[PDB]
Design a protein around this ligand. Structure first.
Ligand SMILES: O=C(Nc1ccc([N+](=O)[O-])cc1Cl)c1cc(Cl)ccc1O
Ligand SMILES: *[C@@H]1O[C@H](CO)[C@@H](O)[C@H](O)[C@H]1NC(C)=O
Ligand SMILES: *[C@@H]1O[C@H](CO)[C@@H](O)[C@H](O)[C@H]1NC(C)=O
Ligand SMILES: *[C@@H]1O[C@H](CO)[C@@H](O)[C@H](O)[C@H]1NC(C)=O
Ligand SMILES: [Ca+2]
Ligand SMILES: [Ca+2]
Ligand SMILES: [Ca+2]
Lengths: 709, 665
């Protein structure tokens, strides 16, 4: 029941003394009512009842019609001394100058939101209805939000106003300040503890990632600068050793005989990514995770001081299993179709294309999995909102984990690991030939599937992050092409911003946790992952700040001293990382066979060399299969007509033709597997013991906090 | 006349202050005068009574006027319990400084203690007396009440919360040991009924197999070629403790530990809700203690041997000597731990207790388990072929086990140590009078005639219980009957501890505690170590993996001759061969020379035979077995840990009733 005063950036009522805390917006009742008048009148009486109750509770309200549309009506709110102080006393809110000194607008909005949520408006049939969500869900209220100080780009016209949003845009947001340390105190003052904790966690995470990236770059540099000493690569590239070894066709009819020379580039890359530096980096990451968690616990203190039925479970657990089942299948089919369409290196282009296709399908399935998780959680009746979001966390994390990680787990553990000798190929259930890796293995394949997935996730998420709000706002503006182009107040143009749905930072935390999973689980195959994480986080801080400050309405401040249900997830991933890295190094990498050959099979008893040497590894490790020993009566003529050669070599430790044991696993195979298992056990035990010692030694609480009290 | 109260006066005792008069130098008289004047002026009543037995030993009592005690903090004396009154008065006395403990230590007071209600043997003469002590003794302490339930509430009301929680923990441990023991005996019986189907033991007794296998001197110079069939009775005994029943029992104990921890946490939660530098030096001592234990065990077995029935008697006597020397070393270990923790000078008493208990537990742990760990893992696991035996130090040969293994005699050592310790300790504390069985003075004088605990009795009881738990959970694969032994031990321990506390020990000041103490972390550490210890025990100490590998792989035409899977020929197709002409690659003195026409012998190892290109080298079977062992360890550890975590997550840790109370309250 008021008109626009004339000042566009006003943060006060028309009088200029009462501060606006919340804006209530609803559609005018004079519109062209359709369907039934009953619903319109009921929602009406509900809105007058709620407003009358709010005024009775002691809140001043003023409204004014929209300057552009005749139907939009905005209703304002205010909280004087008495009610504010009374509610501060009631809710245990823990040198007074003025209103804008000790009751900051964030706390004022929090108190007003509490009052508006706790107020009742109507009781019928002896049932009590209350909660602001019901008003919006029933269509009574279009929205309800507080106001920003001013525009992000230009300073506030009010001289008294601090224009905090301008400071956030200049210093914190905007890529101009890509280097300055973010002012977490200002974030807490302006957005609340929920945002400040998230951004402090992001900053600390990216710092620890910088440390990890420095160490990983050191290890990668050690691997790269030491190349001429990687003897097996020289043997593979040598046309007198590698070129004379006739590898054995991997598939049945689409594969000719091939020589081991062609894989020289892949051998060099493996030498880079399969050195002892990678093992040292895995060992270091083992303690790095513990240091990260413990020092985050310490920071989580200074920050608290400084800033005060099972049917749906089994079903959802079965929805995560079928998701994993379809992920592996889609990866395999993408690889197969890319290979069939095959006409720098052709084996580097095929891998890149297959990984790109798989990443595209995973990104497509992400949204479907999100919707399925929402549907499953809604079926269950949450006890409270906290349990709702906790269940959503536990389901979405598993779904996302099973996506990309079931994508990589296959390459690591079930790619060419249970395939027999050519005489008796292993078929899963018929004509399902089990493909196997090159003599080098699928370490490089996994490293390529991992880097493409990480980069694609980062880039696509960031582009979606900054664009979807932008395009939404642009089209919303396009809906009012009428040439108004005039001065307008703050509230109506804040209503044009996005609502910033109830989930909040759920998606940001989810993406950061998935990135943590990539960087911590498979670090035994890609030491450069922490650098990717560092770059991604450096961009993400500014991306999130910009999107929150420019293309989203002001969240009602809520406060929490912990990030939430993600911390148990971080602990679980920390526990699983050691096992995953141990298995990766044991099986996905050929380090253990190389060490075994160097120490026990390059000597006169086994090899022919006087002293330990790494020479002869390739020739003495590869096996032999006779062409005419192909069993099975079906498909006798895959390639028997060629007859160009007679013996083919394959990547497996089996006895040669002749011998009492034709093609059974030999002593070398059992030595290698025993060494692998001993390595796994020793690494796991040492890493866990060191982690326990480090956790026990550190006080787990800040020293200065103890000093002050 | 055995009166609890003042002479012809209504006032209830809380403590007694005794001293010896200087009449039988005057510094003690002046100290006593100053202390008495300060106490009297402080606002507490006192009365002096000369001991009937000796006039020199003058006893002085105190009281607690209600106004003073209330100010410092149906009937007036029924609102507070006597235990609470005694605790309040003790706190008041501690708050004053001349430190009652300092006066006691400096001779100012001979003792300071509260009083019991009445004699345990006879009921209180006073009809008004509740006679709580007599009823408590008859129904809970005397062994005739062994099978009655434990009145926890009464016990806490009389003594305090510490005693109540200790006894509740002991009772619940016994209750869970009931299930552990029934499952263990079920597994043992299952193994026992399968003696006839134990193929390899029957092969060992079968002379056509056992007697035709000439083993090579297991010892040095002495022990000439010994046939194998002489130990098939030992093999028969071993076949019971080496069956799948032990594996099943270990798997079951893996989850039983989790149940014990989780439900014990629920018990704690319910009880809490219902009621209102020099470190390197210590580690060196630990290392030397472990080495000393190993050395003494080795020397004991050496002296026993160098002098069915023979080997069993030698093992038993070696176990007794090891147990005796361990018990002897225990006193020195306690003394040194106390001294070294005293040199640290902790500021308070709680930190002193924690430091003492951690070091005490570590010393006991090494002293008791060093022999077991050596005889399980480091015995007969790195001795090479007889041609080049391993002398790691020089002239100190490493002993080796029989073809079956050292598991049976490891179980002998465990059974001897556990049982001997318990029985010995029991009799030492208080079981002499009962077997042997099978004027008037005031109450304060009677209590003064008695002796107190010493501030470490509860710590010792907890220590012995934790060591028993360690024996039960760590080496459970070897000895599945350990839980039954623990069950009986605790069944007697509850009653014996109650009896000694109620009869031979002075009344203690009550205290509260929110948990048993620093012992729970010991329990989680013990469980985490026990899982891996059992994994390695089953993998290495027991020959269950070699025989499974033989059954599944080497009874098949590619490596064997049997038409289908079977254990036939395991003994003869697993033992290695040694040629005497290769006596010593070192060209040194050999004992094999001569001794008849014998030219070859067999030994416990999976090496290649003479004449093979890689003769006397580990063969394919050895590597197969090692891979199987490592894989079994990995699988067992991972599955056990996953199951434990799943159970921990599944259990909400609450009775589901706390939420109802929250809603109502
Ligand atoms: O990600 C890869 N390489 C890479 C990534 C980053 C840097 N760098 O210096 O920033 C340098 C390199 Cl060679 C990569 C490596 C291999 Cl073997 C195969 C495919 C790849 O796509
Ligand atoms: C072991 O076998 C030999 C001959 O085969 C024999 O005479 C001896 O009595 C056997 N041992 C036992 C305990 O029967
Ligand atoms: C037992 O093993 C030896 C090892 O060469 C073999 O000669 C002998 O034949 C085996 N026993 C039987 C009954 O064949
Ligand atoms: C043991 O080695 C000597 C070395 O010449 C050989 O003569 C003898 O035959 C071997 N023993 C057997 C049982 O073959
Ligand atoms: Ca992102
Ligand atoms: Ca005892
Ligand atoms: Ca639990």
């Amino acid at each position: 029941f008021e008109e626009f005063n004339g000042k566009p950036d006003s943060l006060f009522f028309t009088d200029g003394q009462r501060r606006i805390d919340f804006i209530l917006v609803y559609e005018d009742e004079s519109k062209k009512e359709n369907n039934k008048k009953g619903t319109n009148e009921k929602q009406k009486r509900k809105r007058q009842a709620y407003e009358s109750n709010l005024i009775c509770h002691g809140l001043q309200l003023e409204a004014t019609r929209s300057v552009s549309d005749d139907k939009l009506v905005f209703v304002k709110v205010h909280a004087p001394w008495e009610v504010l102080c009374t509610y501060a006393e009631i809710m245990h809110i823990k040198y007074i100058l003025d209103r804008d000194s000790f009751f900051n607008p964030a706390t004022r909005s929090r108190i007003v939101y509490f009052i508006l949520s706790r107020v009742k408006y109507q009781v019928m049939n002896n049932v009590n209805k209350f909660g602001i969500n019901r008003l919006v869900s029933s269509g009574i209220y279009k929205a309800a939000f507080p106001l920003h100080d001013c525009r992000f780009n230009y300073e506030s016209e009010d001289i008294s106003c601090p224009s905090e949003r301008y400071l956030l845009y200049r210093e914190w947001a905007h890529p101009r300040s890509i280097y300055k340390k973010q002012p977490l105190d200002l974030i807490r003052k302006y957005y609340g503890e929920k945002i400040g904790i998230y951004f402090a966690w992001l900053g600390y995470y990216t710092q620890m990632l910088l440390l990890a990236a420095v160490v990983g770059v050191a290890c990668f540099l050690y691997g790269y600068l030491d190349q001429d000493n990687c003897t097996w690569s020289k043997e593979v590239c040598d046309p007198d050793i590698g070129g004379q070894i006739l590898m054995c066709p991997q598939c049945d009819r689409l594969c000719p005989f091939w020589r081991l020379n062609i894989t020289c580039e892949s051998s060099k890359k493996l030498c880079i990514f399969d050195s002892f530096g990678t093992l040292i980096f895995a060992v270091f990451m083992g303690v790095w995770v513990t240091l990260f968690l413990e020092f985050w616990k310490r920071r989580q203190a200074e920050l608290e001081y400084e800033w005060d039925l099972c049917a749906s479970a089994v079903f959802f657990w079965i929805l995560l299993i079928i998701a994993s089942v379809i992920g592996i299948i889609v990866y395999r089919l993408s690889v197969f179709i890319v290979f069939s369409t095959t006409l720098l290196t052709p084996q580097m282009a095929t891998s890149i294309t297959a990984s790109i296709i798989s990443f595209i399908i995973i990104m497509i399935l992400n949204t479907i999995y999100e919707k399925v998780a929402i549907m499953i959680t809604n079926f269950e009746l949450p006890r409270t909102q906290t349990d709702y979001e906790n269940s959503l966390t536990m389901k979405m994390f598993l779904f996302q984990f099973v996506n990309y990680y079931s994508s990589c787990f296959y390459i690591a553990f079930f790619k060419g690991k249970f395939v027999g000798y050519p005489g008796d190929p292993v078929y899963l259930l018929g004509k399902y030939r089990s493909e196997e890796c090159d003599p080098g293995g699928c370490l490089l394949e996994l490293t390529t599937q991992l880097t493409i997935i990480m980069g694609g996730k980062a880039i696509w998420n960031n582009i979606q992050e900054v664009l979807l709000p932008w395009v939404m706002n642009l089209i919303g503006r396009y809906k009012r092409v009428s040439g108004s182009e005039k001065i307008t107040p703050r509230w109506e143009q804040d209503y044009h911003l996005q609502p910033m749905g109830k989930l909040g930072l759920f998606y940001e935390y989810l993406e950061m946790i998935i990135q943590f999973g990539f960087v911590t689980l498979f670090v035994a195959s890609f030491p450069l992952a922490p650098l990717l994480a560092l770059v991604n986080n450096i961009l993400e801080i500014r991306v999130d700040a910009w999107k929150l400050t420019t293309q989203f309405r002001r969240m009602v401040p809520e406060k929490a001293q912990d990030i939430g249900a993600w911390q148990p997830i971080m602990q679980g991933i920390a526990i699983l990382a050691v096992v995953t890295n141990a298995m990766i190094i044991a099986f996905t990498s050929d380090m253990i066979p190389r060490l075994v050959y160097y120490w026990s099979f390059s000597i006169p008893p086994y090899g022919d060399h006087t002293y330990y040497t790494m020479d002869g590894y390739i020739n003495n490790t590869l096996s032999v299969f006779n062409i005419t020993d192909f069993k099975n009566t079906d498909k006798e003529n895959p390639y028997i007509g060629l007859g160009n050669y007679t013996l083919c070599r394959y990547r497996d430790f089996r006895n040669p033709p002749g011998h009492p044991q034709e093609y059974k696993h030999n002593i070398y195979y059992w030595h290698v597997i025993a060494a692998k298992l001993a390595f796994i056990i020793v690494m796991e035990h040492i890493i866990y013991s060191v982690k326990f010692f480090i956790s026990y030694a550190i006080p787990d609480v800040s020293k200065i906090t103890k000093s002050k009290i």
